[PDB]
């Protein structure tokens, strides 16, 4: 008797269908909350060899040729289209939210230059690394827009929202910034100390986002959070 | 719409007969927090229209009145959120990434106008086009931003990080690449070739990427 009450599941479908008989006043509800989203790998012709410990966020559509190191994260909503030119990510490079680490085809003169990002590279939220190489242990800024062929030297932070023009590879430690490609200052050594601290803390923080890959049973068992 | 509201009620009324009506039979399947952004072409009384040869990425939402033509593409993460007035995206355009095309609703402070994106427009990443009558074969740069009523005329290669101002009818072929909108240089012809060829580049790259599948082995793994 119970489990034969699947008739109520079939009865629901009639009404779950009555949305068709009710989408007539205008063309309504062409969305159906579908299932397919070729996102988390979306291999075009080359596959990412991302590690078993490099947390990528299921929103992050890491397309094509990509490689991430042990401990580095690929945070929420960051597309990495390594489709036309190779990409890579060192161990500890936390490419933060809303990134655009999609490389190039060309821009007005050749400049293939596969984006390679070293270790401990704390990249900021909403960063746009369109076609630059980035060196180890630097801290790109939340909102930065790193254009073609901009070798961001080591331990040189790019400012928040700091667009960097083409070819203007910043020096080491020289904090850049500004809508035009101009330097700002050489801050301090505590700056690099905090760079490394934030890099390792973001690494283990991404290691704390293991709940993102939990199983249905584990999600509903976390739903015990009410009791505690 | 009234009958649209009634439809929401019958679907809700039905959805309850499944939620605990037949699911209570030991089934917590409906209790899973699956995503809902996969409604790429989110709808209203106005709906988003998209032709065949127009790749839409599944990481990208296309909300509001949209008219994606031929060759146009909406790549991974973009949001053509245009509820108020139609996002009349033309043909062969190339949004290319986490961009945004808004007629997003305000308190009619500037009378938000439709965003008639032109043809072969290879908009770059993070561009935040907002009430933009951007014309055809135009380039907008990475991380860029635009403002209400802008008219990026033919071949107007807006540069990276740029912030075009309100109602600025940028001239045809003038490069404006700054936070205060500012003409910089008459564009060269090699840039014209690049912008007119990157159009078909992505047009092909978007007809590629061939999502159109399913990966059950991964589904079976994530099941356990």
């Amino acid at each position: 008797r119970a489990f034969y009450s699947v008739g109520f599941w079939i009865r629901e479908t009639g009404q779950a269908l009555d949305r068709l008989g009710c989408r007539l006043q205008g063309k309504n509800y062409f969305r159906e909350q579908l299932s397919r989203h070729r996102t988390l790998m979306n291999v075009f012709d080359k596959a990412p060899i991302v590690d078993k410990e490099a947390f990528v966020a299921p929103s992050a559509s890491v397309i094509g040729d990509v490689h991430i190191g042990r401990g580095s994260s690929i945070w929420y909503g960051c597309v990495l289209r390594g489709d036309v030119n190779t990409v890579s990510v060192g161990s500890g490079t936390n490419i933060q939210d809303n990134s655009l680490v999609h490389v190039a085809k060309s821009n007005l003169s050749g400049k293939v230059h596969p984006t390679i990002i070293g270790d401990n590279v704390t990249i900021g939220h909403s960063a746009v690394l369109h076609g630059c190489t980035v060196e180890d242990e630097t801290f790109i800024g939340m909102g930065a827009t790193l254009l073609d062929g901009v070798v961001v030297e080591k331990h040189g932070m790019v400012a928040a929202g700091a667009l960097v023009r083409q070819n203007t590879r910043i020096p080491s430690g020289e904090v850049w910034g500004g809508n035009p490609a101009r330097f700002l200052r050489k801050l301090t050594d505590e700056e690099i100390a905090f760079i490394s601290q934030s890099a390792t803390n973001y690494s283990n923080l991404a290691q704390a986002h293991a709940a993102e890959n939990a199983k249905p049973l584990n999600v509903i068992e976390f739903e015990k959070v009410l009791r505690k | 719409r009234a009958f649209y509201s009634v439809g929401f009620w019958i679907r809700e009324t039905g959805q309850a007969l499944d939620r605990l009506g037949c699911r209570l039979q030991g089934k917590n399947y409906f209790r899973e927090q699956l995503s809902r952004h996969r409604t790429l072409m989110n709808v209203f009384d106005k709906a988003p229209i998209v032709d065949k040869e127009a790749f839409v990425a599944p990481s990208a939402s296309v909300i509001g009145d949209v008219h994606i033509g031929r060759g146009s593409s909406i790549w991974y993460g973009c949001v053509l959120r245009g509820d108020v007035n139609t996002v009349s995206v033309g043909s062969g355009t190339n949004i290319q990434d986490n961009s945004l095309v808004h007629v997003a609703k305000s308190n009619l402070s500037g009378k938000v106008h439709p965003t008639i994106i032109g043809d072969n427009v290879t908009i770059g990443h993070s561009a935040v086009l907002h009430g933009c009558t951007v014309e055809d074969e135009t380039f907008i740069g990475m991380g860029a931003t635009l403002l209400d009523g802008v008219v990026v005329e033919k071949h107007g290669m807006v540069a990276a990080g740029a912030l075009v101002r309100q109602n600025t009818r940028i001239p045809s072929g003038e490069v404006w690449g700054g936070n205060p909108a500012r003409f910089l240089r008459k564009l060269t012809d090699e840039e014209i070739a690049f912008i007119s060829q990157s159009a078909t580049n992505y047009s092909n790259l978007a007809q590629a990427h061939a999502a159109e599948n399913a990966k059950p082995l991964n589904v079976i793994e994530f099941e356990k």
Partner: peptide, 27 residues
């Protein structure tokens, strides 16, 4: 092909209680 033992008894009881409510008006 059934739910936990005792849940069935409660589901049967609800129908017998609802049958009684229609029945109370009927008889």
């Amino acid at each position: 092909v059934s739910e936990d033992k005792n849940r069935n008894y409660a589901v049967v009881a609800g129908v017998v209680a609802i049958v009684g409510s229609i029945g109370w008006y009927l008889k």
